[PDB]
Amino acid sequence: GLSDGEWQQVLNVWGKVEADIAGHGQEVLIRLFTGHPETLEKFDKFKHLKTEAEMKASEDLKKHGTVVLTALGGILKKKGHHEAELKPLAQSHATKHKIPIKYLEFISDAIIHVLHSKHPGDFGADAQGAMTKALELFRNDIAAKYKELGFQG
Ligand code: HEM
Ligand SMILES: [O-]
């Protein structure tokens, strides 16, 4: 798990996201979709986004980014005691949305990238370490639920 000190770093970093949830969420999704176009195909409602300009101009994409980061933030604030919050997300992503765990790895990486891009020089090595541990814990707990379901893709 994460130490108390690491959790404090995670939630300090998260304050930066909370100042502009929509902006961070949009950039995370655009980073995901442009780096990994297969992920866009999982979103019937974003499939029409044929260019990054279209992605940037999409208010519904920003809206979904808000939904995604709001959910993640609620999970992070539980500091690992997130079974109730995480189980339903894992199950909806496996059974309804059909999201392979690889794509959760991709979005975790996107979050780290966006944090550096939006806060260059203000996302220190300790902060990156702590946030990485938190995202790995999130991903790994989802992975356990995916295994229960026998879900791969
Ligand atoms: C940080 C990781 C993620 C979080 C916190 C998250 C959160 C959410 C939430 C809260 C919803 C709405 C409720 C639900 O259906 O469960 C949702 C819907 C959805 N998610 Fe995610 N998600 C994540 C990653 C992903 C990834 C990586 C993909 C695909 C590459 C994805 C695909 C979808 C799709 C297709 C929907 C339905 C969208 C719609 O048509 O309204 N999610 N997600
Ligand atoms: O999502």
Side-chain angles (χ1 to χ4, degrees):
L2 281 70
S3 68
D4 296 319
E6 290 166 337
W7 280 120
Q8 185 174 42
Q9 269 298 69
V10 170
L11 296 185
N12 187 60
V13 170
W14 198 253
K16 308 186 181 292
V17 176
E18 290 180 337
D20 182 13
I21 285 282
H24 284 81
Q26 176 200 53
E27 290 191 34
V28 164
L29 291 175
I30 292 175
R31 178 69 181 192
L32 178 66
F33 293 158
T34 61
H36 312 275
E38 68 271 33
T39 63
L40 188 72
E41 296 310 302
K42 291 295 178 172
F43 286 91
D44 287 335
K45 71 174 182 171
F46 296 133
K47 275 179 187 183
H48 70 277
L49 292 175
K50 294 305 181 179
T51 67
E52 177 172 341
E54 289 181 9
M55 292 179 195
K56 294 276 180 168
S58 172
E59 298 303 327
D60 197 51
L61 193 149
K62 292 175 198 165
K63 184 182 178 178
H64 192 68
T66 295
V67 166
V68 168
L69 293 191
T70 297
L72 180 55
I75 290 166
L76 295 173
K77 296 189 183 176
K78 296 296 182 172
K79 296 164 69 193
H81 300 283
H82 55 218
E83 166 72 14
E85 292 80 11
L86 186 146
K87 186 189 171 178
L89 190 60
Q91 296 198 325
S92 80
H93 284 66
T95 310
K96 180 153 217 321
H97 308 310
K98 315 294 191 197
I99 306 307
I101 195 77
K102 188 73 173 179
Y103 294 5
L104 278 301
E105 178 193 3
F106 295 159
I107 204 176
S108 294
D109 288 347
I111 289 165
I112 296 296
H113 179 86
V114 169
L115 286 166
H116 280 296
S117 181
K118 291 186 79 57
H119 313 280
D122 188 43
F123 182 38
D126 51 5
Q128 180 175 335
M131 184 60 74
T132 296
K133 278 186 72 169
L135 293 169
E136 285 175 328
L137 178 62
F138 169 75
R139 187 155 80 250
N140 194 249
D141 285 352
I142 290 173
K145 304 295 182 194
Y146 275 24
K147 179 177 177 277
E148 295 183 0
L149 300 167
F151 177 73
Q152 287 285 354

